[PDB]
Amino acid sequence: SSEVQAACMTVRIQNMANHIKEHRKDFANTRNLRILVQQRQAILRYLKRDNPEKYYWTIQKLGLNDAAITDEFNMDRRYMQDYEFFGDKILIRDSKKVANQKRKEIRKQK
Amino acid sequence: DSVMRKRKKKMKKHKLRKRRKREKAERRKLSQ
Amino acid sequence: DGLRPGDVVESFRRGIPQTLLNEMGGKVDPAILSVKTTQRGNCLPISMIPIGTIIHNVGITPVGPGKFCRSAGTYARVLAKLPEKKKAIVRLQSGEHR
Amino acid sequence: KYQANKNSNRNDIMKSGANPLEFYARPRILSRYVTSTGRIQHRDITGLSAKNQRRLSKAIRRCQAIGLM
């Protein structure tokens, strides 16, 4: 059943994500982690399409929301930056985008 | 392709490389 | 380089301490002095330092303080020992074997 | 011309079915599959299966690592 599948690969995801944290350099394993995460997304989308009650029950049991399942996820370096997979910046914004954000820092009175 | 067009493209690439090497100073001046 | 608050360092200029002296059966007999002989932080006479070890605070006389390789990031390497002449060749950071 | 080497065939325990990698601790057993200077004989000379030969090679290389060879 979809929920059991999701729970099993959730355990696998936790374990081998812990490994990736331990080994930053390995890239093939990172590829497997991204593929497995996408597989969990796919099965859960089906579970939504079939039995919504179990869908929300299981995603809330594991610790995910409908957002983290429907949206496209690519294991991008921006994801690791935002959610602090390691702890240090990997991507670097150019002065254009940086200054665009700097200017965007309105700090408006509101 | 054969070695005919491969030779032609090689020469064009070489000429472009040399042309861009000679104009290094002008490029620097125009781009500040 | 790696000293941090919490580590333990010791000095052996007087010689092997009493604790090891009564532990000679399990300390000197297995020659596990190598565990503490080549350790970061503790100070030894050059006689007990194995050849090739990276060392600093090198003196000149047995009853003198360290004088060489005290600056930031400085190190010296022990090259040879001459028990007969009571002298040891110490490669020094300037590159002069002394 | 037709002189065969079936004496080996009956006496090579390696092709009997035994796991080569197990024998890494017995230098002699692998010693008969190395030339004078230790070079591993080619599959043709040994004549083992591909998997048996590859495991034998791993065993001897390991045995060299521990230094028995």
Binding site: - | - | - | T35, S36, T37, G38, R39
Partner: protein, 95 residues
């Protein structure tokens, strides 16, 4: 009854314990065969050819190409030997 005396009775054993596999004893009567077989055992270890190839460096791609070429040549020759044997047998059998 002490050290270094039993040693002299064991030094020879110790010596032949360490052998490189190149050790060769020449016959007193005739030396031609001793060198001749030493020459053959040089070839069987291919140290001549490999030393010749060891004086210069070749690209990894080139060595791979050469290794494949030699393997095919050996395989082709062995196949040719097989066919030659079968034709000799067939000739004898009357075909």
């Amino acid at each position: 009854l002490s050290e270094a005396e039993i040693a002299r009775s064991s030094v020879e054993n110790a010596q032949m314990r360490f052998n490189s596999g190149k050790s060769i004893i020449v016959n007193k009567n005739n030396p031609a065969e001793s060198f001749k077989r030493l020459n053959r055992i040089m070839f069987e270890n291919n140290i001549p050819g490999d030393k010749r190839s060891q004086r210069f460096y070749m690209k990894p791609g080139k060595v791979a190409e050469l290794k494949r070429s030699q393997r095919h040549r050996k395989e082709f020759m062995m196949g040719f030997k097989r066919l030659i044997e079968i034709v000799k047998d067939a000739k004898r059998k009357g075909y």
